[PDB]
Structures are given as structure tokens and as C-alpha cells.
């Protein structure tokens, strides 16, 4: 009969960078998705493989919740079977995904005058990511032919780039907060429903 802790994930003060997204496990408790779906403050609520309305009648073994902050134009890359600089190097969703994607504009909390530079995103890599993987290594990128180590002079670029957020940016540049859920719906005794 434990209420389920959805309040320390949606109302966290600071989300993490997209390249180091933070994941939280959810077990026991009693989920209640009707309140989330009726908030009417999210600008994007897409559910794959299950309709949101029928989410109060079936239950699962465990629920995964991972969150990050990305640009306003890259929000369409968080979907199964999409390509871009975010879906290839930062966060990848498997093609048989079954969950919901929630996002909402957060200009008033993540952008300050003079620019906010605490949010980073990977920009250079030698291969795409497998679904549900992270990398936090910042080894110097090798481009061209001449090998280089510990230097960033020519054709050797620092991988991580810095988002620049300002309150006066356009709608396509203001930061957005994303939370992605995931359900297994297979085997084992269930633990999360009510």
C-alpha cells in the first residue's frame, strides 16, 4: 500500500546531462498513472505498446525511469527507430520498446541570463550506441591520419560539447526535460499496480 515515489524524479531540482543520464529503479509501491496523465502540463506523452488510459489495470515486475535534459529540436529523436546526433551517440531506444515518453518545457528552471553551460552532450564518436548504453569516457577524439594523445591542436577534438541556454532563445533552443519509462510485462511475480 506504499505510494509510489514519482515525486523525487519529476520534481528533482537538477537533472543530469544527456550523455550521463541517471536511471532509478522502482519496486514494490503502488503506481498511479492517472494523476500524471491528467496533469495537462506536459507537451508530449507518447506511449508505445500500451494506451495511457488502460495503465491503471495491468502491472509489471519492475519499472525503470531515466531522465535527462536536451534541446527543444531534438525531442523528436527520442523514439524507436530514429537517427540524429542524440540517438546515435547519447541515448538509443530499442526497436521493440514498450513504454512511455514524457517531456515538458522547462525554460524557467534550467536557463539563466549570461548563458548556462552546465549541460553537455557528446558530439564525436567512432560508432553508434547499442540500445540502453552509456559512455562517460572523455578520451581525446582521433580524426584525420596523424595520431595524437593528450592534445587538442589539429584534427583532435574534445568529445563533449556544451549546451548554451539563455532565457531569450527561441522556442527551438530552450531546454526540455525528458523522462522515459519502461515496462517488461513478462514472467515473475508482479510488484507494481493499484
Amino acid at each position, epitope marked *: 500500500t506504499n505510494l509510489c515515489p514519482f515525486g523525487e524524479v519529476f520534481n528533482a531540482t537538477r537533472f543530469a546531462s544527456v550523455y550521463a543520464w541517471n536511471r532509478k529503479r522502482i519496486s514494490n509501491c503502488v503506481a498511479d498513472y492517472s494523476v500524471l496523465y491528467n496533469s495537462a502540463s506536459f507537451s508530449t506523452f507518447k506511449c508505445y505498446g500500451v494506451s495511457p488510459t488502460k495503465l491503471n489495470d495491468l502491472c509489471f515486475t519492475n519499472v525503470y525511469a531515466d531522465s535527462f535534459v536536451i534541446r527543444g529540436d531534438e525531442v523528436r529523436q527520442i523514439a524507436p527507430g530514429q537517427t540524429g546526433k542524440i540517438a546515435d551517440y547519447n541515448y538509443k531506444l530499442p526497436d521493440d520498446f514498450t513504454g512511455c515518453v514524457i517531456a515538458w518545457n522547462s525554460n524557467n528552471l534550467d536557463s539563466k*541570463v*549570461g548563458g548556462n553551460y552546465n549541460y553537455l552532450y557528446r558530439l564525436f564518436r567512432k560508432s553508434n550506441l547499442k540500445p540502453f548504453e552509456r559512455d562517460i569516457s572523455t578520451e581525446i577524439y582521433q580524426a584525420g591520419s596523424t595520431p595524437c594523445n593528450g592534445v587538442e591542436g589539429f584534427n583532435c577534438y574534445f568529445p563533449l560539447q556544451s549546451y*548554451g541556454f539563455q*532565457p531569450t532563445n527561441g522556442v527551438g533552443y530552450q531546454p526540455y526535460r525528458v523522462v522515459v519509462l519502461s515496462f517488461e510485462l513478462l514472467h515473475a511475480p508482479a510488484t507494481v499496480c493499484g
Partner: antibody
Amino acid sequence: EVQLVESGGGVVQPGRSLRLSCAASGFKFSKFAMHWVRQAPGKGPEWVAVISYDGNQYHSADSVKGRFTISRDNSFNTLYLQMNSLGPEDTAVYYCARDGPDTSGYYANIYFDFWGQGTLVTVSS
Amino acid sequence: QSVLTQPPSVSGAPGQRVTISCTGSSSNIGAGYDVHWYQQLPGRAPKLLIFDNNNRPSGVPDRFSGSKSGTSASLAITGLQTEDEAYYYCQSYDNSLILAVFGGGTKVTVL
């Protein structure tokens, strides 16, 4: 010790243009953003403008937009403020202030930790 | 002009406590942004006194405390001496006007 010294203030007739600066010392000038804050005589302080740590992004107050331009030299450890077409409501003691290192909750909170000394700027004839 | 509303002057005598209340609107403080306080001696540049809610910085006595609740904030001075003859300002941030805002300032007087 963090210390900031400014100069460039003086009496001027209305309609002219002035340029003043403050020079920092004792810390890595490149890492921290900077703000310009003025204080009218008898009233409270007012915010003016801000520049990023590399000069690529900046912002100005609505009151003085289109008249005040700020610039920064990272190697020379000086930042400049340029005023054009001074008016009678620009008499103040302009201070240059340093952005706050740590602010805990949220990312939109700003505060000023180290202040300069100020220069008296007045307009008359 | 000052967006934040502050009392014009606060009197006092050595020994007891005095309080300064800095009240704000819906956007500036009610949104959730914090409140900071500075102290300006007569003839000197303002100096940071209380950054963030309470959270005193280095090199300050413990006589100064502050707190924020609802849409207002208050600063408390304990065991006042004659040395605190100065001005005090409250500062915050506003998300509608999109600039940092300052209070009207209070001149604490010691009798």
C-alpha cells in the same frame, strides 16, 4: 585576494559618449562571468548588463538597451562598458561585479560575491 | 525603481533583536528562486552578507540569520551592537521581467 579596480568616470555634457573599465587580479579571469551594476544616489542598486566567460553571449537590461554595449578582453584581464548618448538619468556610481561560484538550488539563481569600488559618473552642463 | 518591497527604516537598541522583512510578488519569489542579502557601510561598496537562504559566507559573525517562506523573506540580527549602522538590501531574480531585482533597502538604526 580578489580585488577589482575601475576607472573612466568624469563629468560630461549630455549627448556625448564615454567608455570605462575595471581590471581584475588574483583569480582566473576567464572562468567567471561578469556583471555591471549601477546605483543612483539615494536609491537602491540596479542591474545593467552581463557577459559570458568568452564574450560570445551577452544580455542587457531593457532600460539601457540600444545605448550600452559591453565587451571583454580575456587575455588582458579587462572588461569595458561603452555608453552612447548619455541622458540626465544616468548619474550613478557604476560597479563591476563578479558572478557567484555556487548557488545550490536551481540554475537560474544569480548573486554577486565580490564588488569593485565604483566611479562617479554625472552628466550636466 | 525597486520591485521588492522593503520597510524604510528599522530602529533598535543594543541587546535585543531586530528583523527586516522583504516581500515579493508571484514571479520573483513565489516561483521558487532564493533570496540574498548584502550590507553596505556608509561610504563603501556593498559587500555580500547572506548568500542563499541563510548559509552565511566566510568571515561573518553568527548574529545574522535569514529565512524565506511563502512570498516573503526575513533577516534577523541577534545581540545588536553599535557597529551595525549601515544599509541592508535584499536581492532575487524575476522570470517575467527577465532580470535580477533589488530591494529598496533598510537603514538599521541603533539607539
